[PDB]
């Protein structure tokens, strides 16, 4: 039920993604199950995601392509 | 001494489960921590 | 005396202390917009 409530808060901040983006929350638990079933406690696994998510915003900023130097409405048309 | 001798030693060692529980969730050996503390409390001197 | 107000949306990092009284409810907002009012007195009406 927590994953269902994600679409409520996502539509407030973003406004879309229920047809596409919301799927990303599914597979996050797929590979997180195989790790907790052997040795490593979920704390080290989650803190490993915290240190990765902290730098993941900067990793996106490296591949980030700003919107500028485009002819006409091609940007707004492609986003549409 | 007296009858309270061994009783107070068990009550003093009853609090040893608090650092032992913290070592289980952190992936640390219980004796490895306790063996050091016996040396630490005679060396580390409290605040360590 | 410490008041806690809940608001849906945003992040916990943006949570900060407010310099004025915050209420959960508000006006019906049917056909008035008093809104931002400079130099206004805050009264309390118990009677209906």
Swiss-Prot record, chain A:
Compartment(s) where it occurs, according to its Swiss-Prot or TrEMBL record: Cytoplasm
Source superkingdom: Eukaryota
Subunit organization: Heterooligomeric complex of about 850 to 900 kDa that forms two stacked rings, 12 to 16 nm in diameter.
Function (record text): Molecular chaperone; assists the folding of proteins upon ATP hydrolysis. Known to play a role, in vitro, in the folding of actin and tubulin. In yeast may play a role in mitotic spindle formation.
Protein family according to the UniProt entry: Belongs to the TCP-1 chaperonin family.
Protein name: T-complex protein 1 subunit alpha
Gene this protein is translated from: TCP1
UniProtKB/Swiss-Prot annotation, chain C:
Domain of life: Eukaryota
Compartments, record wording: Cytoplasm
S-S bridge residues: none
Note: Present with 5530 molecules/cell in log phase SD medium.
Protein family (similarity comment): Belongs to the TCP-1 chaperonin family.
Self-association state and partner proteins as the record states: Heterooligomeric complex of about 850 to 900 kDa that forms two stacked rings, 12 to 16 nm in diameter.
Described purpose of this protein according to its UniProt entry: Molecular chaperone; assists the folding of proteins upon ATP hydrolysis. Known to play a role, in vitro, in the folding of actin and tubulin. In yeast may play a role in mitotic spindle formation.
Protein name: T-complex protein 1 subunit delta
Origin species: Saccharomyces cerevisiae (strain ATCC 204508 / S288c) (Baker's yeast)
């Amino acid at each position: 039920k927590i994953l269902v409530e994600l679409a409520q808060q996502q539509d407030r901040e973003i406004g879309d993604g229920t047809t596409s983006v919301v799927i990303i929350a599914s597979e996050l638990l797929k590979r997180a199950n195989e790790l907790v079933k052997n040795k490593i406690h979920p704390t080290t696994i989650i803190t490993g995601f915290r240190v990765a998510l902290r730098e993941a915003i900067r990793f996106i900023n490296e591949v980030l392509s700003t919107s500028v130097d485009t002819l006409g409405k091609e940007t707004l048309i492609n986003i549409a | 001494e007296g009858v309270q001798a061994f009783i107070w030693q068990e009550f003093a060692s009853a609090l040893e489960v608090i650092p032992t529980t913290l070592a289980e969730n952190a992936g640390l050996n219980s004796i490895k921590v306790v063996t050091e503390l016996r040396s630490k409390h005679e060396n580390g001197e409290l605040n360590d | 005396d410490i008041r806690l107000v809940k608001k849906v949306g945003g992040t916990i990092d943006d949570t900060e202390m407010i310099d004025g009284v915050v209420l959960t409810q508000t006006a019906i907002k049917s056909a008035g917009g008093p809104t931002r009012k400079e130099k206004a007195k805050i009264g309390l009406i118990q009677f209906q």
